[PDB]
Design a protein around this ligand. Structure first.
Ligand SMILES: [Mg+2]
Lengths: 50, 469, 100, 99
DNA sequence: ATACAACCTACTACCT
């Protein structure tokens, strides 16, 4: 259990979410964000829940 | 009953060293040779003009289709083709008020009206270029259709609504040559053809089936104006320089003069095609005579040879001078007094006046493009317009006209001359089409001449074509 | 070729291809191979049609993460290549001669 | 005007049969995949058409077998899209049957 | 300055 989950409005909070996620990765924290780590052609709701 | 000879279609060069015949297809698959990072656009016009330009810029990015994607290839979007950003967010606006336009638009004299409107736009252009801290690659001038309609040389202003050339476009581009600003002039009806309808409730200009072709042409022109090279010739030989001479009448002065402008093309040691102008239009004081003086001919050839030597390192082996006129003896002797022994001078005359039409016997289509009819060792016909099998349609409208190519002076192979001309027809950067009729040298020399003879106060004009086309 | 050769199954999602019979048959075969191969990201839909809303995609696709080609094809191709390098899809050295 | 019942096909059959028959006996139109002895060629397409065009309620048999079943989840997603389309908040009614 | 032939440019109008 190392991931850090960031929830946001996907097309409206993109700038702040990307800024914060890249910053938190900068200081060695593992971050999971749907705009940077959600794969393509995947069941995204099941993946998010897992 | 005479015979014909076929000249193979030339191949132009694209990214990754990939050759193709169609500029649009080569751009779609491989892409441009240059790598522009993005285009920063400056927009001038009323608020409606800015809205129109922004809407068209947003429309460009999405793919655009034509009625037939075989005859006219589709446009997959600006970034998908050119791999650079031309967005509406990078737009810099310099508003021109409608009241200001109307203050000068309705005037008795067309010269005064066009001068006032041209000055109104150029003042904003130069003020934004000098006193603003943002960088603008190309300035896009959105012009209301009234300005286009009422600023022509022969246009008349209705009596109810009541130097330098009396033409908005030529005078506009001629008065911006001191500051070297590439400009693209658009009409509001070009980018918003749907919103301008006639008395019958239908648009005056119908781009419904050729939307992608319009996108192709506009995007290619904008990319070239921003400093990008979309394609280049692939089969041109080394050591040969192509010159194109065009004479134009100057009515600005009291005494008519015939200004001669040129275009120069060759190959550098880096395998890049150097295509530029040759300016300082050498005038002739005799009206109706289109032949250069010995001094002006010497100056022209010396400048061309010096430019070639500076760019390469040695004088060219061969020189071809494409001209719509026929060189006389005195001018050619003057030309030969400059060339060294190692340089061969060839003077070719290209015309489209000879009325020879070839009708296919059993079809609704026209003669194939590239066909030639060699009249003799110094004269031939070339069919640069005709049916192109690749697009399954003809470039001409009813029946194509041939080019009567004649080697007026010097010794050269006529088939080689025809091949060179048919390869030159692929270098038009003002349009994104299949190869056009006339060679690019003559066409771009004409484009230079139409601007250099507009305003007299041009001491040393630039050589790049983004300031003219 | 779907069963024994392909490692990824790209499906062009549009209004025409939403309910096309042959496309649906190919989708069913691809789903069978996806379940067999234990590959969660075998099927990748590329949404290219603005008319077809995201609420009208067929039942075999409505759960998958699609690639948006509607606004820009260049962005879509960038996303495709990013996913392909991220998922270690096999590829050779780039060569435009093959395309030509 | 149909009522769609989504379940794990071989595991939740007793409760699904009981509920479907009880609802049919009470005067409701019930669409369940166990109420069709012979299955046609088009199953998934017909299921999606039924969900989008016919059903007015979507009963989900929430159990341990039906928690992460692919068909049940696909029907759930289609039903969520349909509920969004019809602007009905209570289109999906889950039924908790598993302890 | 008239007649001709053989070349030259400038300025629009319409189609796609
Ligand atoms: Mg242009």
């Amino acid at each position: 259990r190392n991931k850090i989950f960031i929830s946001h409005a996907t097309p409206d909070d993109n700038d702040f979410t990307r800024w914060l996620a890249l910053k938190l990765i900068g200081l060695g924290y593992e971050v999971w964000c749907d705009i940077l780590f959600l794969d393509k052609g995947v069941d995204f709701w099941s993946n998010i829940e897992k | 009953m005479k015979e014909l000879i076929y000249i193979e279609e030339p191949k132009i060069l694209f990214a990754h060293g990939q050759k193709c015949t169609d500029a649009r297809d080569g751009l779609a698959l491989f892409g441009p040779l240059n790598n522009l990072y993005g285009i920063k656009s400056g927009v001038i016009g009323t608020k409606q003009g800015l809205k129109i330009f922004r809407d068209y810029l947003d429309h460009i990015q999405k793919p655009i289709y034509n009625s037939n994607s075989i005859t006219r290839p589709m446009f997959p979007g600006f970034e998908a083709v050119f791999d650079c950003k031309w967005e509406s967010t990078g737009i810099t606006f310099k508003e021109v008020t409608n009241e200001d336009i109307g203050k000068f638009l309705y005037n008795s004299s067309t010269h005064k009206r066009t001068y006032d409107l041209v000055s109104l736009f150029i003042d904003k252009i130069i003020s934004a270029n000098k006193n603003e801290d943002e960088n603008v690659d190309v300035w896009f001038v959105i012009v209301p259709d009234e300005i286009y309609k009422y600023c022509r040389p022969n246009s008349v202003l209705p009596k109810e609504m009541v130097n330098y050339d009396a033409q908005f476009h030529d005078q506009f581009k001629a008065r911006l040559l001191k500051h070297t600003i590439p400009t693209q002039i658009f009409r509001e009806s070009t980018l918003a053809w749907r919103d301008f309808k006639n008395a019958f409730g239908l648009p005056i200009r119908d781009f419904s089936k050729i939307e992608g072709h319009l996108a192709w042409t506009i995007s290619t022109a904008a990319f070239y104006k921003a400093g990008g090279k979309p394609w280049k010739l692939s089969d041109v030989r080394n050591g040969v320089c192509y010159l194109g001479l065009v004479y134009k009448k100057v009515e600005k002065s009291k005494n008519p003069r015939n200004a001669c402008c040129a275009a120069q093309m060759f190959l550098d040691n880096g395998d890049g095609t150097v295509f530029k102008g040759e300016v300082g239009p050498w005038y002739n004081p005799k009206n109706g005579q289109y032949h250069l003086e010995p001094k002006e001919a010497k100056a022209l050839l010396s400048q061309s040879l010096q430019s070639y030597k500076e760019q390469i390192g040695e004088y060219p082996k061969e020189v071809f001078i494409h001209a719509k006129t026929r060189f006389n003896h005195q001018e050619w002797d003057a030309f030969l007094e400059v060339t060294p022994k190692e340089t061969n001078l060839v003077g070719v005359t290209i015309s489209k006046t000879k009325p020879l039409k070839l009708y296919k016997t059993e079809g609704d289509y026209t003669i194939l493009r590239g066909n030639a009819y060699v009249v003799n060792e110094r004269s031939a016909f070339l069919w640069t317009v005709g049916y192109v099998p690749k697009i399954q349609t003809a470039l001409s409208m009813e029946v194509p006209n041939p080019l009567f190519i004649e080697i007026n002076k010097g010794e050269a192979d006529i088939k080689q001359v025809l091949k060179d001309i048919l390869s030159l027809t692929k270098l038009n950067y003002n349009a994104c089409i299949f190869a056009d009729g006339e060679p690019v040298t003559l066409r771009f020399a004409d484009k230079i001449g139409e601007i250099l003879t507009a305003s007299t106060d041009i001491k040393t004009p630039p050589l790049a074509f983004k300031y003219y086309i | 070729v779907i069963r024994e050769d392909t490692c990824k199954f790209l499906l062009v999602s549009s209004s025409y291809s939403n309910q096309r019979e042959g496309v649906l048959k190919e989708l069913a075969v691809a789903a069978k191979v996806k379940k067999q191969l234990k590959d969660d990201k075998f099927i990748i839909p590329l949404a290219i049609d603005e008319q077809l809303s995201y609420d009208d995609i067929n039942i075999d696709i409505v759960r998958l993460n699609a690639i948006d080609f509607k606004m820009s094809w260049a962005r879509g191709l960038k996303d495709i290549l990013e996913a392909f390098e991220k998922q270690k899809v096999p590829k050779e050295v780039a060569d435009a001669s093959k395309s030509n | 005007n149909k009522i769609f019942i989504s379940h794990a096909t071989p595991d939740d059959n007793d409760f699904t049969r009981w509920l479907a028959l009880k609802l049919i006996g009470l005067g409701y139109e019930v669409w369940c995949d166990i109420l069709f002895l012979d299955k046609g060629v088009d199953f998934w397409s017909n299921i999606e058409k039924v969900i989008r065009e016919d059903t007015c309620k979507f009963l989900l048999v929430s159990s341990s077998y039906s928690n992460q079943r692919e068909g049940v989840l696909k029907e759930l997603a289609v039903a969520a899209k349909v509920k969004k389309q019809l602007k009905d908040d209570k289109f999906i009614i889950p039924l908790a049957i598993d302890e």
